[PDB]
Amino acid sequence: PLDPVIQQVLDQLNRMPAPDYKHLSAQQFRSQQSLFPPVKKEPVAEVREFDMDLPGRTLKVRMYRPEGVEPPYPALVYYHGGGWVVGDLETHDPVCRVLAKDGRAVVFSVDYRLAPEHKFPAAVEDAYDALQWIAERAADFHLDPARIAVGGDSAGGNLAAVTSILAKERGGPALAFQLLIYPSTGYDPAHPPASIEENAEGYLLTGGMSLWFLDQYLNSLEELTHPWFSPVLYPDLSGLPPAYIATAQYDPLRDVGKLYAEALNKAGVKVEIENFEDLIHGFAQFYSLSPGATKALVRIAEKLRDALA
Ligand SMILES: *S(=O)(=O)CCCCCCCCCCCCCCCC
Numbered sequence: 001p002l003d004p005v006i007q008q009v010l011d012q013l014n015r016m017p018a019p020d021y022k023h024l025s026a027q028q029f030r031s032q033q034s035l036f037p038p039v040k041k042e043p044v045a046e047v048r049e050f051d052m053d054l055p056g057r058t059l060k061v062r063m064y065r066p067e068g069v070e071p072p073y074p075a076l077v078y079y080h081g082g083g084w085v086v087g088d089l090e091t092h093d094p095v096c097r098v099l100a101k102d103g104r105a106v107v108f109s110v111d112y113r114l115a116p117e118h119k120f121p122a123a124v125e126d127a128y129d130a131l132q133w134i135a136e137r138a139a140d141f142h143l144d145p146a147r148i149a150v151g152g153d154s155a156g157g158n159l160a161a162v163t164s165i166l167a168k169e170r171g172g173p174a175l176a177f178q179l180l181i182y183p184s185t186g187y188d189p190a191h192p193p194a195s196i197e198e199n200a201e202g203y204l205l206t207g208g209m210s211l212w213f214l215d216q217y218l219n220s221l222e223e224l225t226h227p228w229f230s231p232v233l234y235p236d237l238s239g240l241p242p243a244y245i246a247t248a249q250y251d252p253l254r255d256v257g258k259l260y261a262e263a264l265n266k267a268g269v270k271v272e273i274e275n276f277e278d279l280i281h282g283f284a285q286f287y288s289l290s291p292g293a294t295k296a297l298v299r300i301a302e303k304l305r306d307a308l309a
Contacts, residue, residue, distance in 0.1 A: 002250065003278040003292035010202060010280070021212040026116055029212075030086045040288035042097040043067070049089070052133045059130055060111035062089045063141070064100040072138075074147035074308035075106045076179065077131045079163075081154030081282065083213030084115050084123050095153065095284045095297065099179075102301035105308055106143065108134050112159065115217040121228045123217075127152075127159035128166045135173035147308045149177035149241070153284055154205070154253070155213070157183020157245075161231040161260065164240050177307040178243035181300060182251050182281050184210075185260035186230020193255030203250040205281035210252065232260050237267035244303045245273040246296070251281035272303070 002010075045067040052059045065073070076099060080092035089111050100107040112126035131150055138145045150160040157180035167175050187193055200207035218229065227234040243264060247257035254275065261273035276283065276296045283293035284300075 001278055002280075003283075003290050005286065005290035006278070006280055006283065006292065009286065009290070010204065013204065014202065019208065021208050024212060026085050026114070026216055033082075033086050033091060036091070036285055037289060039094040039285070041094050042101045044097055044100050052130060054126075054129050054133065057113065057126075059113070059126055060089060061130070061134070062093070062096070062109040062111075064096050064107040064109070066100040066104055066106070069104050069106075071142035072144035072147075073106045073142055074104070074149070074176075075108060075134070075141070075143045076100075076103060076149045076151050076304060077108045077110060077134055079110055079112060079127050079150075079152035079156035079159040081152065081156040081181075082114075083210070084120070084155045084217040085213055086114070091285070092153070092156075094287055098287055098297050099151070099301045099304060102298050103304035103308075105149070105304060106141065119219050120217050120223055123155070123159055124162050124166075124228050127163040131163055131167065131175075132173055145174060147176050148174065149179055149304065149308060150175050151179030151181070151304070152183070153181035154184055154281065157181055158185060158229075158231065161185050162228050165227065165231055165234050165237075168239055175241040177304070178241045179300070179304050179307075180243060180245045180257070180260070181284055182246060182248050182253055183257055183260065184253055185256055186232045187256050187259055188230075188233065189224045193259050195254035195256070196252050199250050199252040199254065203252070203280040205252060207252060232256075232263050237264055237269060240264060240267070240269045242270040242307070243272070244300070244307065245271065246300050247273065247275045248279040248281050248283055249275060249277045250279065253281060274299075
């Protein structure tokens with residue numbers, strides 16, 4: 001079935017007017033993000049924010065150092081979700097804390113630029129350049145160069161997967177692991193995985209909502225098959241960092257996640273994929289509220305922990 005609290009979330013959500021994507025704007029939708037209930041912020045030894053001055057832009061970064069972990073620390077460069085349009089350092093702050101605290105790794109939450117103000121592939125360039133910037137400063141952050149992972153949820157998982165591919169092409173930096181939480185890893189639009197139609201409606205992330213995101217992020221039809229947008233279409237996935245993929249049973253992106261796992265495995269990359277049976281897309285954001293989401297996110301963090309051990 002469906003997690004009890006998730007069920008109550010959808011009930012409260014379906015009480016609202018049917019979204020009007022034809023007229024919804026990025027600003028309007030960013031406001032709707034305040035609808036997410038307050039969540040518990042797990043404690044960490046330290047939270048620090050700093051600027052990364054990159055060509056053309058300064059990206060904010062929130063670093064979370066967990067308690068009781070000795071340097072050189074393993075790290076996770078994290079990219080928040082939100083369809084490449086919404087979200088920020090605050091929306092996924094609770095998520096990053098859990099990953100740091102139970103993942104036993106220093107998490108760097110990257111405030112990448114959002115569309116439509118910055119269309120594709122700005123976010124992608126930000127994800128990569130941010131990882132480069134942080135790895136370059138491994139020493140300054142007391143990080144173990146060999147234990148730096150990339151990860152993210154939804155659009156964030158997409159950015160992590162694409163960043164991995166770009167690091168491979170550019171000879172670095174070294175990525176030890178890929179944490180992809182119900183990621184949007186792409187697929188050939190002409191041949192969608194079964195979950196796209198199956199969970200198209202009523203489970204928070206909907207077909208219409210994804211369409212709306214795509215219209216804000218992408219510039220043209222042709223980019224739907226662009227590898228930087230659909231990493232699963234990249235011609236050669238071998239040599240990519242080993243990965244852990246979490247999918248949700250009621251997520252339209254469920255089989256998309258499975259598609260990437262399958263693709264990575266076929267390319268000889270070690271990959272573990274787990275489907276959470278009673279959850280929906282975005283369940284991490286209900287950490288400490290939903291019992292299913294809480295155990296799932298903690299589990300995901302422990303998967304990360306074992307990965308960087
Ligand atoms: S991915 O990046 O493609 C998925 C991005 C998720 C976008 C979610 C947009 C959500 C608007 C949510 C309003 C939620 C209100 C929740 C509380 C209701 C009880």
